[PDB]
Amino acid sequence: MKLDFSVAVHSILYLDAHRDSKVASRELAQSLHLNPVMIRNILSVLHKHGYLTGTVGKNGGYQLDLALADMNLGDLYDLTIPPTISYARFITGPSKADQSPIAANISETLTDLFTVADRQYRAYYHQFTMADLQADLNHHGTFLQHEQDSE
Amino acid sequence: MKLDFSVAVHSILYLDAHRDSKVASRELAQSLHLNPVMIRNILSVLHKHGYLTGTVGKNGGYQLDLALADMNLGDLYDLTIPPTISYARFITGPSKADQSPIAANISETLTDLFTVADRQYRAYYHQFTMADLQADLNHHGTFLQHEQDSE
DSSP states (O other), X not given: OTHHHHHHHHHHHHHHTTTTSOBOHHHHHXXXXXXXXXXXXXXXXXXXXXXXXXXXXXXXXXXXXXXXXGSBHHHHXXXXXXXXXXXXXXXXXXXXXXXXHHHHHHHHHHHHHHHHHHHHHHHXXXXXXXXXXXXXXXXXXXXXXXXXXXX | OTHHHHHXXXXXXXXXXXXXXXXXXXXXXXXXXXXXXXXXXXXXXXXXXXXXEEEOSTTOEEEOOSOGGGSBHHHHHHHHSOOOSOOXXXXXXXXXXXXXXXXXXXXXXXXXXXXXXXXXXXXXXHTOBHHHHHHHHHSTTHHHHHHHHHO
């Protein structure tokens, strides 16, 4: 399901190359090298949130008529890979009085740790747009250079 | 397997509370609420890398004789959850001439994107030590306050 971000990125880029066209799921799935059943949900999510138009029926399909420069990459990431609230699967000890100091406190400490860390991760993508991503696709090493420049 | 970080954190904290003792896997597993078979590997990894001593046999077990202040949290994170090099499972298109511009370039662009983002994530933990983590366990909200102070 973390594949969803790439499905969205790849689909937006594909639609940007074919702005004169409605593109059905089957055509997008060919390009993404996926079963349509596996991308249908993401295309629907992008449609519902205003990324894509989506006419139904014969010769219907998805179409992009907005600018990549207006699509924050972090907004896209956050939509396709929504933030975790519960980190319980990654935390040891008990679940929710004679808890040991460690057992009683570990879940709240790690939850805060992982949540802050995840905000720092997600902050990275918010610096960029889909136009930056398209820039990198055309001139490789652009993200790597941005990292060097920041360091 | 991302549970491994918490297993290591929790085990180090447990051993810090019992520095007069050798603690066998069975005792640690009781505290972590895990089967010993599931923590044996991490305790071995921590031992091999100098975190813990580990005498074998009757009344043997693990023992901590180093300072939490000397254990970088990011070093620990990186050891227990090693960096991904291949992001192929999270990337669409083809695998490694008539590739479309998008298909030919997406894997390298997303790989760079995800790799840089992951360095920014991992940088977060490198700011702290196990003594900071123990501080938060005893006074909750310490990591949250550090985030506010940074903002």
